[PDB]
Design a protein around this ligand. Structure first.
Ligand SMILES: c1ccc2c(c1)ccc1ccccc12
Ligand SMILES: c1ccc2c(c1)ccc1ccccc12
Ligand SMILES: c1ccc2c(c1)ccc1ccccc12
Ligand code: FES
Ligand code: FES
Ligand code: FES
Ligand SMILES: [Fe+3]
Ligand SMILES: [Fe+3]
Ligand SMILES: [Fe+3]
Lengths: 446, 192, 446, 192, 192, 446
C-alpha cells in the first residue's frame, strides 16, 4: 500500500477505511510514523520518586527502562544490551544504581553508560570504546505535571505544544488541583483489539455509554446512572467535545466529579470536588474551576487515555493489528485523604481494571470492530465519524480548540483521525506540519 | 519452614503451611470438599444469587491481587506492591451479580459456559477463633463463549469460612494472589 | 507471485503445485478470485422457514446474516454495523424483525435497512442519510430445491447454470424424491488443513476409501464393508465419475443407498430407497430413478460437499491456508418417517460429525498433505491427479458432463482444478468464461 | 433455586442441583470417586474392552451434545436446539471400541497418550429408583500424539450408574453438554 | 486385563491396574491424598529444602522419561526406547534444589509462580513389602513467569512411598512417562 | 530486502544487524541459502545400524526419512508421498523394507522407489511411470566417523572439505578414540529463539559461562566450577578458539575431559580420558592426544552443535525466526564400559537435556536476544562480536584455521557470521566460493 497516496481517512476525518483496524502492513507502518514519532506515556514521578528508582515501560512494541537520575531528572533507555542484544531488566520496577546483563555480565549505569565489562583488561585491553556503548537512549523525555512522556524523535514538538488546545482542559485537574499521583502497579490485560479501538472510544465516544454500559449504569448507581439503556439523553449544555492539531481530544461532561464510582463514593467525592472548586473559582475563574470537577474522557494521542474524576488512566500498548496490552492505573489528587485515595484506586480497578465490570462491557465492541477490519468484504468499507459535522467551531472566546458544543458527538474522532492520516502519509515532523497547516479549517467545514 | 534456609519461600506462605501440617482432621477436609464443590456447582450454572445467599457471608472480603514483578534481591523500592483486581464487600459482590443478571448485559448473550475444577483441598480450624475454618484449595476455571473464545484461569485460594444464618458455613474471606501478571484471557470477569 | 502467468495447475488438471495447500498469499488471492466470485452455501429453507427466522453463515472469511423476509424471499447481509463496524449478531440462529448494535444502538431491519438511530433527531437532526446506510447486502441469493446459496459477485451465472452438468445427477435426490430437509444445528470443528484438501477428497476420491477407512469399514459393517483394507475392488460398472465447467463434480456408486450407515440402518434404508425408486422409474426413467438411490460423493465448487444417501452435508469454511472450520449437517428426505430422520441424523454425526469415526480417519491425511505445502522442498512439487486420464468422455447419450465410466479415478479432481486455475488467473467472470471456452476438450485429451 | 430470580439458570440445571443439596451421604461420594477414578484409569491406558466390560451397562445411553448459540431473550425460534456428537447405545460404543483397536487404524500409530483429571465428584441415590445412583463429575482430558499435537477437553458429566452383573456398578447414562461450540481440538474422538 | 484382547494396552499398564482393583482401603486413599496435597503445597511455594526433608526418601529414584515414537506394529527395531529427562538420586535432587535457591540463578528473578492440581489418587500396599505404599496420581502443573510466559504440564505419576525418619512417609520412587514427545513449555524444569 | 546488497554482517564479522534474529523474510531466505545449500546433521550409524533401520530427521523445515540400505549405504528421502503429498512416516524410528501411504496405499521401498500401487493393473493399466515416481531423494549423504549428514545441493563440497580446519580438532575424539556412538532417543524441546542464538553460543561463547551458568557451576561442582559468578578467569593458555572457511568453529578448553559432569563422574572420566591420552601420544602426538581429552564447544555450520567430553550433541531445528526445536543426544566413546556410557548419557540429559539445569540458564538469554530482533528500535542495531579482533592468526604451525590463542573471545562468531553473510548474498556454491576467496585475510585484519 502506498501511504503517501492512499486515502485511509477521508477529508475532515468524516470516515476511515475499516482495514486500519486489521491491516498488519499498516501496523508495521504505524510503528514508524505513529509510535516512533509521537509522545508516549512512560510513568509518573510518584512511581519513581527517588534517585535510582526505575520502571519498565513500552513505547510502541519497544521496551524501555525509565530511571530517576541522581540530579533529579529522568532518562529512558532501550531495555536491550549493547553487546549481543539480551533484555537487560526482567522486572517491572525497582531501585538500582545500574543494570547487569545476565548473558555476559556487562554493567550499565542508571544513566545508560557502559560502566563495567567483566575482565575488560584481560580480554579487551584498551580496545573497547565503552563511551560509544551506552544504552540506546530515548531522545526526548518531558513531564506534564508529573506525568512523564517519551519520544524517540528528536524533532518532535515540546510535549506542552504537542498537547495543544487539550492542555487548557487538563490543567485545572493536573495543575491547579495541587497535583495528581498515579497509583500503581497497573492492571495488565491483553485484548484482541487494535489499539485505535479503545483510543478512539476514550477520545470521543459519549454516544456509546448509555447502550454499551446499560448494565453497569443500572447496577452501580453511579452519578451517570440516568443514561442506562438510552433511557435518557443528557440535557442541552450538559457538555462539550474538543480536539486539537496533534490529535489529542476529549469530551467534557459538566460537574460529573464522582464519575463512574458507585453510590458508596458519590457523596464524599461530590463534597471534596465542590469544596476545591469553591477555592479555585478565585484562582482560575468559574469556568476553569468547573472544568476541574467535570468528567473528562481524553486521549493523549496516540495511545494514552484517561477519565478524570473517575480517575481511570490507560495505556493501549500495541502488539499487532488485533492485539493490545491494556495497562490500567488510578489517578488521585495528592491532597485527598489517604483512605479516600485507597478507596478511589480500588474503585478505578473495580470498574475499569482487569475485572472492571464497565470495561468488560466494551470488550466485544472493540474486539469485533477490530477483527472485522481483516475480513475481505469489510477492508475497503467506511467507518463513519460524521456526527456533529458542520457544527464545530474554532477560536471560541471561552473554550479553545476545535469544539463541538454538545455532550455527544464525533468531533474528537475527526481530530484524532485527521492527525493520524497526516502522520501516516508523512516521513517526518516537517511533513506532518505541512499536512496540518489548515487543520482546524478542515475540521470545521460544512 | 525456615525461610532463611528455604530462600525462595515468603513469610506469608510459610505461615499458611504451618496451619495445615499440625492438626489434621479428616472429617473437616471432607466437609470443606463438599462446601467447595457445591459452591463451584452454583457458580458453574450461573446461579449467582443462590451463590450469594448460600455461600457468601455478610462480612465477606473477596480479594484477588496482581503483584508487580520486582527483583528477588530488591530491598529499597517500597511502593504499593500489588493492585486489587477484586477487593469486594458483600454489597460490591451484589453489584457484580446484578450486572451479570441484567438483561442488557449484551456480553451474556449467547449464554456463557463455565466449568470449574477444584483440587488440593486442605482445611483447619483457627486456633484462636474456634468457629473460623481455614480452607485452601486450587481452581482451574474454564470459560467458553461465542463459538471459539476459550479462557482458562488457574489459582490458589486462601479462604476463611464461618457458620452464619441457619448454621450454614459461608465465605468470610477469599484471597487469591493471581499467578499470571499479564492476563491472556481478555479479562478476569470470573469468580475464582 | 503473478497469478496471470503462474502455472499452479497443469494442462488438463493433471497435476497441481503442492504450494496451493500452504501459500498464504495465494489464500488471500482466493478470497478475491474464489470466495468473492463463486456460489457459497448459506442454509436451507428448513432452518429459516418462517418470516423473521435467521441464521449466521460464513462466506469465505466473511460472516453474513441470512434472513427470511416477510414476502417469503431470503436476503443476506454482512454481519457488520454500518457505523463503526461492530459485529451485529453474536448468535447462530433465531427469530427477529431486526438487529440492534450493542455499541451505539443502531437498529437494522431483517431487510437490512437502517431503521433507527438512538436520539437521531437530537443528534443528527435531518442530516443522516439512513437510506444509504443499510447493511452491505450479498448481491445474489438463490435456491436449489431449498438449499440456499449466496454470491457476492452480481456477474455470476445463475446458480442452476453454475451447477452445470452436476445438476442432472443431484435432481433425483434433491427434486424428484419429494425434497430434502437439512437437520441442524451443524457440528463445528477446526482442522489444520487447507479447505481444498477435503473439497478435492469429496469431489473425486473413491480411491482412498478402502485404505484410509479400512478400520471404519471393518468396524461399522456398512454396505461398502467389502472394501476394507483394499480387500476387494468394486466390480466393473460399479459406478462413474463426473465433472463440469464451473468445477462441481461427483462420484456415483450404484445402488449404495444405505451409504456409510451401520448395519443397524441398512435394512430400513435399503427398503425405503428401493420403494421410492420403484415409483420414480415411471416418472423419471430407470437410470435416473437408480441415480436417486445411488451414493453420490459431491463437491459443489468451491467448498460445499455432500454424500447423498449417507446424508452427510459439509461446508469447508476457510480460515487460513492451513486452517478450515468444518460444518457438518445431516440431509434427510422430507417424506421419511420422523423416527428414521432422527436416527439418520444421529448416524451422520456418528460417522462424519465432530466425533465421526469415519471423518477421523481422514484427519492426518488432510492435515499433513496441507501442511507439507508449506515445506520448502515440497512447494514446487507436483500433486498428481492423472488416474483415468485419456479415458474420460463428454456428451455421452446417457450421463452428462465430463465422465469417467469407472467407479474409481481422478476425473473429478481434474475438473475441480481446471476451474480453480481458470478463476485464480482471471479478474472477473468474463475472463473465466474466456479461459473455459474449451473446458471439456482440455479434460478429455489423451 | 428460583429461576425467575436467578435469571441465568436453566430449569434443568436447577433440578440437578436440588439432587445433591438434599441427602449428603459421605460414603457414597467416596464410592463414586473410586468408580470414576478406576473408569478414568482404564480409559487412560486405552483398555477400551475392559472399560466396556467393567464400567458400561448393557442399557447405556452415552450422549454428548453441542447446543446451537441462541439469544438469551429468544422465545420464537423453535427448531432443534442441539446435535449429538455422541448418542450411543452399547452396540454403538462397541463399534467405536473395535475401531480404536483395529490394526489398520492408522491414526493410532504411534500410540496416543491420554491423561484424565476427574474432579468435583457428587453422588446421590435416586429417590424413586433406590438402585439408581446419580453421579456428577467434571473432567479435563489431555490427548497427546505425533510429537506436537496436544488437545485438551473440558466438560461436566451427568451420569447414572446402576448395579449389574456380579453386583458391579456400571454406567447406564452419561450426558455431557459440551461447553465449546466450535471444537479447537481437531475432533471430539475421545471418551469423556 | 487380557492384553491379547485389549490390543492397545501395555503389559506394564495392565500390571499397575491390577494393583488397585484388588484390595481397596478407603483410609489409605485418604492418607495418600493428604501426603500428595502437602507435597504439592511445599513445591508450589518453592519450599524445595522442606520438600527434600519432609517428602523425599534417602533411597529415592525420581524418574521422568520421554519415549521415542515407534510403530504400533514394530517388532524388530530394538534400541533404547526412551531417554531420561530426570533420573535422579537424592544427591542429584539436592543439586537441583541448590540450583533453584542460588542467588545467581537469574531466571528465578522475578520469582516464578507455581500452581499444582493433583487428582485421581489411588493407593495400595505392596503385597510382598508390607511397608511399601504404591500411590498413583495425576498432576496438572501451571508455571507462570515474566509477565506473559505460561507453561502447563500434564502427567500421571507412579509412586512408591515408605516410612522413614520419625515414621514420616517419604517418596522412594516416582516414575513418569511424559505424554508429550516434543515439549512446548520451553523446558521441563519443574518437579512433577 | 535486497540480500545481494544488504550488509547484515559487517566486514570481518565484527557485528551483525539485530534483525537477523527476528526477520521472517530473512528466515524464508535462509531456507534457500542456508538450509537447502549446506550440510545438516541427520543421524548416527549407531541409531540405524542394520538393513531396514530408519529414522526421521529434519533438514531445515523439511522432514526426511533416513534409511539403511541392504548394501550398507544410507539414503534419505523427503517424508512426502509422491501422489497427493501426505506425510509417509509418522514415527521417529523403526525397521522396515518400505513405507505405505495411509491415504491411498502407495508403497515405497526403503530405497525410495515406488514399488506398489493398489489395483495398479485395474486402475492405471500400464500408464503409471513408477520409475519416475520415487520419493524425492536428498542429493548428498555422507559420514564423518559414523555421524551422517545430508545436503539437498548436489554442488556442495564433500563433507570432509566442508568441515575445513575444524576436522583436525574433531578427529582425535571422533576418529582416534576408537569412535563414538550417539545414544538416542534425543530429548526434544521447543524454545522461542532463533536457531542462530544457540548456534553462535556453542560455536564461540566461552565468555558467558561464568556468569550465565553461575548457579550450575556453583551447584554441580563440575571441573569448571571455579568460573562461577566470574569469580575467576581461566589461566593464560587455558585454551584457544578457531574458525574455518565454511563457517564451522569451536573453542578448546585444555584438559577438561569431565566437562560439565558433576563430581559424581569426575574421577572416572578423568582417569579414562587420561589413560587413552597416554596411548594416543604415541599414535597422533602429544598435542593431538591432548586435544582428544580437551573440551571442545563446536558448531558444525549451520545448526549442529556439540560439547565433546561433556558429550552433549545438539540440533537447532528451525521453525520460524523466533522458534527452534532443540534435539539433544549424548555422545559416548564406544570402548567405554557400558555402565559408564549409561551414566554419561543420563548426565548429558541432566545438564543439557529437556530438564537440563545448565541449558535452562541459557533460555532467557537466547529467547530475549532473538525476540528483541523484531522490536522496531533494535532491528537496525548492531550485535557486537569484536572481542579478540586483531589478535587472530591463520596458518599456525601447530593449530590450523583462523585461531585466537586465548580461551575466551569472539573469533568463532566472526567466522560463523562471515560464512553466513557469504551464503545469504550468494545464489549458489560458486558464488559463495567467490565471496570467500579471501576469507582468512578478512578475519585476521587489524
Ligand atoms: C469512554 C469510557 C467512558 C466514558 C466515555 C468514554 C465517555 C463519556 C463517559 C461519561 C460517563 C462515564 C464514562 C464515559
Ligand atoms: C469422500 C468421503 C467418503 C466417500 C467418498 C469420498 C467417495 C466414495 C465413498 C464411497 C463410500 C463411502 C464413502 C465414500
Ligand atoms: C556453550 C555451552 C557450554 C560451554 C560453552 C559454550 C563454551 C565453553 C564451555 C566451557 C565449559 C562448560 C561449558 C561451556
Ligand atoms: S548480551 Fe549482554 S553482556 Fe552479552
Ligand atoms: S458500531 Fe454499531 S451502532 Fe456504532
Ligand atoms: S497421498 Fe499417498 S497414496 Fe495418495
Ligand atoms: Fe465504554
Ligand atoms: Fe475419507
Ligand atoms: Fe550456556
Amino acid at each position: 500500500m502506498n501511504y503517501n497516496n492512499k486515502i485511509l481517512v477521508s477529508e475532515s476525518g468524516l470516515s476511515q477505511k475499516h482495514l486500519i483496524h486489521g491491516d498488519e502492513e499498516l501496523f508495521q507502518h504505524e510503528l514508524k510514523t505513529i509510535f516512533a514519532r509521537n509522545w508516549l506515556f512512560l510513568t509518573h514521578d510518584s512511581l519513581i520518586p527517588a534517585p535510582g528508582d526505575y520502571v519498565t515501560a513500552k513505547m510502541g512494541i519497544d521496551e524501555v527502562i525509565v530511571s530517576r537520575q541522581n540530579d533529579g531528572s529522568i532518562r529512558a533507555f532501550l531495555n536491550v544490551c549493547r553487546h549481543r542484544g539480551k533484555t537487560l531488566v526482567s522486572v517491572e520496577a525497582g531501585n538500582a544504581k545500574g543494570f547487569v546483563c545476565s548473558y555476559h555480565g556487562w554493567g550499565f549505569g542508571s544513566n545508560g553508560e557502559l560502566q563495567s565489562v567483566p575482565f575488560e583488561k584481560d580480554l579487551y585491553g584498551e580496545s573497547l570504546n565503552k563511551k560509544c556503548l551506552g544504552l540506546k537512549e530515548v531522545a526526548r523525555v518531558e513531564s506534564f505535571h508529573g506525568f512523564i512522556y517519551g519520544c524517540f524523535d528528536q524533532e518532535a514538538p515540546p510535549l506542552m505544544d504537542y498537547l495543544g488546545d487539550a492542555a487548557w482542559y487538563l490543567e485545572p485537574m493536573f495543575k491547579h488541583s495541587g497535583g495528581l499521583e498515579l497509583v500503581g502497579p497497573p492492571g495488565k490485560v491483553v485484548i484482541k483489539a487494535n489499539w485505535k479501538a479503545p483510543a478512539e472510544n476514550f477520545v470521543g465516544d459519549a454516544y456509546h455509554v448509555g447502550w454499551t454500559h446499560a448494565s453497569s449504569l443500572r447496577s452501580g448507581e453511579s452519578i451517570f446512572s440516568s443514561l442506562a439503556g438510552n433511557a435518557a439523553l443528557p440535557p442541552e449544555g450538559a457538555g462539550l467535545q474538543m480536539t486539537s492539531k496533534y490529535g489529542s481530544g476529549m469530551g467534557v461532561l459538566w460537574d460529573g466529579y464522582s464519575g463512574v464510582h458507585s453510590a458508596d463514593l458519590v457523596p464524599e467525592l461530590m463534597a471534596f470536588g465542590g469544596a476545591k472548586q469553591e477555592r479555585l473559582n478565585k484562582e482560575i475563574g468559574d469556568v476553569r474551576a468547573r472544568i476541574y470537577r467535570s468528567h473528562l474522557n481524553c486521549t493523549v494521542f496516540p495511545n494514552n487515555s484517561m477519565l478524570t474524576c473517575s480517575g481511570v488512566f490507560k495505556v493501549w500498548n500495541p502488539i499487532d493489528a488485533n492485539t493490545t496490552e491494556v495497562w490500567t492505573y488510578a489517578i488521585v489528587e495528592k491532597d485527598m485523604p489517604e483512605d479516600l485515595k485507597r478507596r478511589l484506586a480500588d474503585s478505578v480497578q473495580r470498574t475499569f481494571g482487569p475485572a472492571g465490570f464497565w470495561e468488560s462491557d466494551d470488550n466485544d465492541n472493540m474486539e469485533t470492530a477490530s477483527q472485522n477490519g481483516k475480513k475481505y468484504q469489510s477492508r475497503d468499507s467506511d467507518l463513519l465519524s460524521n456526527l456533529g459535522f458542520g457544527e464545530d467551531v474554532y477560536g471560541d472566546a471561552v473554550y479553545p480548540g476545535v469544539v463541538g458544543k454538545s455532550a455527544i458527538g464525533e468531533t474528537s474522532y475527526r481530530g484524532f483521525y485527521r492527525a493520524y492520516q497526516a502522520h501516516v502519509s508523512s516521513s517526518n515532523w516537517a511533513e506532518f506540519e505541512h499536512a496540518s497547516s489548515t487543520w482546524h479549517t478542515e475540521l470545521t467545514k460544512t | 519452614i525456615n525461610i532463611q534456609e528455604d530462600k525462595l519461600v515468603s513469610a506469608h506462605d510459610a505461615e499458611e503451611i504451618l496451619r495445615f501440617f499440625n492438626c489434621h482432621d479428616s472429617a473437616l477436609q471432607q466437609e470443606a470438599t463438599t462446601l467447595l464443590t457445591q459452591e463451584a456447582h452454583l457458580l458453574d450454572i450461573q446461579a449467582y444469587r443462590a451463590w450469594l445467599e448460600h455461600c457468601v457471608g455478610s462480612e465477606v472480603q473477596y480479594q484477588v491481587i496482581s503483584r508487580e514483578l520486582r527483583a528477588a534481591s530488591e530491598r529499597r523500592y517500597k511502593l504499593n506492591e500489588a493492585m486489587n483486581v477484586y477487593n469486594e464487600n458483600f454489597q460490591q459482590l451484589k453489584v457484580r451479580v446484578e450486572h451479570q443478571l441484567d438483561p442488557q448485559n449484551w456480553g451474556n448473550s449467547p449464554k456463557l459456559r463455565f466449568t470449574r475444577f477444584i483440587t488440593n483441598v486442605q482445611a483447619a480450624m483457627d486456633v484462636n477463633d474456634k468457629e473460623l475454618l481455614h480452607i485452601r484449595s486450587n481452581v482451574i476455571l474454564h470459560r467458553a463463549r461465542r463459538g471459539n473464545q476459550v479462557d482458562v484461569f488457574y489459582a490458589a485460594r486462601e479462604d476463611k469460612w464461618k457458620r452464619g444464618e441457619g448454621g450454614v458455613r459461608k465465605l468470610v474471606q477469599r484471597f487469591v494472589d493471581y499467578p499470571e501478571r499479564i492476563l491472556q484471557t481478555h479479562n478476569l470477569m470470573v469468580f475464582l
